[PDB]
């Protein structure tokens, strides 16, 4: 099996191709920036009602309705304007680890240790919410899921694989293989034709939803990648790992650009999310706090304190008006 | 907007009934299609034990979901691939995991050249051997218990307690001791 010699000689050619394509780091050409200073964001709303730790949340396209997944076995839909609960969906499996809100606002998905992405109909003619389809076929825990339309959805699983599902038939039309570690998070591009994936191997891969091939592979992290999120332009993405740092990768450059870290921060990142402009990089940490990173200068522009337990998820609205921050204290906080 | 508060009142009324059954239920993780659930109830106290099914051997991610359970039932097989020492390192990683320092572990147990400290090891007289048991069997059995207890008493930081045992009543009495210590620490008594 000494073709490993070819594999090590080929990855050196890729590494030397990245060194030649790098004139100056993004942080180097940044002195033309008016510093944003201290970003003091305050808790404008606190949605209570969840019984156990909150693992994931997802905003709707209307930026008013949001779904939250807590490990107590309940999927609550919140109206962030009036704190009113629109729906309270009981789940068959209480160990939910992710939740998704469809762009049309008619369906919501969730998954976890049951390896099943349950689809729920929110616009039944009877008026109640029940299960639409149970997407089974994954051999590992569901870590993330994102809707492409009312009938298509990609899921990430702990079996080092990602799959594209057909909600009408309940079949996997495309399975994405190539990862070696437990996949933790996914994120679609604004054109929803590509999506990056973060696994437990300090590597991120670029996928094509149609052809089902791994376009690019990005390394540079030292521990398991915990969260991932695309840039608003779809040409870059950020990663959160257990090595207590965030790194921003680049698609057409195929090289790590920025490293968001500090000596006083020795805890990993649990969630990442860009704002509407992409100027700020919000990241949830394991020290029960959230740190707003300047995506261009790599300097922390603000801290989001107030959560009494580990922050799990982070979501920025489509219009960039609010930020919902879920944590293990069974509380959701809205910031501005 | 007025009809919206009517639905919010209907939902919060259901959430209050769902809190009564969740806070009065002991959740347990069994270690040793994705997850098998088992609802058993002892002395009219509801227990919800979860057995991990179709999941890979990499546990450093999905084990954090069980950080708020009452106790993790860690079953060890007292054994050649040296399976017992592999469980010692797994119990070591679970005991010193950042999110399981407050999660107690109910240790359920069930050699000669794989542990050199077994030669000069003496049976503690505080042990209670069962009647009709060979003394060297007692020494080898309690030696494995001391290997797990040595890891459990090497880190005083954390609310986790290790309960070694050599079946449902043992879990019931242990969970009662865990919630009792949880109540004493809320009042800064223990």
């Amino acid at each position: 099996d000494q073709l490993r010699q070819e594999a090590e000689q080929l990855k050196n050619q890729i590494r030397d191709a990245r060194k030649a394509c790098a004139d100056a780091t993004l942080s180097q050409i940044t002195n033309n920036i008016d510093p944003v200073g201290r970003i003091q964001m305050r808790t404008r709303r606190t949605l209570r009602g969840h019984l156990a730790k909150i693992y994931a949340m997802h905003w709707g396209t209307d930026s008013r309705l949001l779904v939250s997944a807590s490990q107590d076995g309940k999927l609550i839909i919140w109206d962030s304007y009036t704190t009113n609960k629109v729906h309270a969906i009981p789940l068959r499996s209480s160990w939910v680890m992710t939740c998704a809100y469809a762009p049309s606002g008619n369906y919501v998905a969730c998954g976890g240790l049951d390896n099943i992405c349950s689809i729920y109909n929110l616009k039944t003619r009877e008026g109640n919410v029940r299960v639409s389809r149970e997407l089974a076929g994954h051999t590992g825990y569901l870590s993330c899921c994102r809707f492409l339309d009312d009938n298509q959805i990609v899921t990430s699983s702990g079996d080092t694989t990602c799959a594209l599902w057909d909600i009408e038939t309940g079949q996997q039309t495309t399975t994405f293989t190539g990862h070696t570690g437990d996949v933790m998070s996914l994120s679609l591009a604004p054109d929803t034709r590509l999506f990056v994936s973060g696994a437990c191997d300090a590597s991120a891969k670029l996928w094509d939803v149609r052809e089902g091939m791994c376009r690019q592979t990005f390394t540079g992290h030292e521990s398991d990648i915990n969260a991932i999120c695309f840039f608003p332009n779809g040409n870059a993405f950020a990663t959160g790992s257990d090595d207590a740092t965030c790194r921003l990768f680049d698609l057409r450059a195929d090289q790590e650009l920025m490293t968001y870290s500090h000596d006083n921060i020795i805890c990993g990142i649990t969630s990442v999310s860009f704002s509407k402009s992409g100027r700020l990089l919000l990241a949830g940490y394991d020290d029960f706090n959230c740190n707003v990173w300047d995506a261009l200068k790599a300097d922390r522009a603000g801290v989001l304190a107030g959560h009494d337990n580990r922050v799990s998820c982070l979501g920025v609205t489509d219009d960039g008006m609010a930020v919902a921050t879920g944590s293990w204290d069974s509380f959701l906080k809205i910031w501005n | 907007e007025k009809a919206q508060r009517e639905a919010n009142k209907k939902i919060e009324k259901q959430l209050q009934k769902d809190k009564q059954v969740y806070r009065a239920t002991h959740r347990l993780l069994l270690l040793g299609s994705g997850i098998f659930e088992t609802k058993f109830q002892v002395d009219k106290v509801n227990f919800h034990m979860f057995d991990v099914g179709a999941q890979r051997d990499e546990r450093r991610k999905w084990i954090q979901c069980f950080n708020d359970v009452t106790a993790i039932i860690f079953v060890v097989a007292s054994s050649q691939t040296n399976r017992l020492q592999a469980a010692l390192k797994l119990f070591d990683s679970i005991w010193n995991n950042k999110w399981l320092r407050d999660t107690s572990v109910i240790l359920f147990l069930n050699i000669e050249d794989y542990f050199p400290e077994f030669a000069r090891y003496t049976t503690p007289e505080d042990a209670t051997p069962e009647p009709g048991e060979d003394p060297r069997v007692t020494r080898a059995k309690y030696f494995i218990r001391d290997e797990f207890l040595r890891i459990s008493t090497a880190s005083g930081d954390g609310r986790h307690y290790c309960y070694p045992h050599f079946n449902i009543r043992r879990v019931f009495n242990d969970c009662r001791d865990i919630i009792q210590r949880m109540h004493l620490r809320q009042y800064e008594l223990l």
């Epitope: 070696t180 521990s223 257990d242 | 051997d57 450093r60 390192k89 990683s93």
Partner: nanobody, 126 residues
Amino acid sequence: QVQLQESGGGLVQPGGSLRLSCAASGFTFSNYKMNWVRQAPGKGLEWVSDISQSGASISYTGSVKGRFTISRDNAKNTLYLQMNSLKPEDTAVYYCARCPAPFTRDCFDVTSTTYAYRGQGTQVTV
């Protein structure tokens, strides 16, 4: 990129000596805990020895306690395993392992299959 390329190995008569070396790169060697994992032919992976980030806390398996010793040069980003008085039971592929959590007392998912952050392995035949 976590490479963790190992050195050493070879055929040594029973009762000889050998010294294994890990060539770590892509991460900070001083912040992560190191481990030694070997795979006997026809058997599963097993933990050999680990050493703390500082170098004080040291543990071995019972089959190697007293004969093998663990060492790490934090200034050189390398890990040493001086093997003394080897046995024919030590014939296995020795992998240099590293659990991903830094600054942590727990060292998870070592000695596991399909597990990254571990080297290709060196063959020590006795």
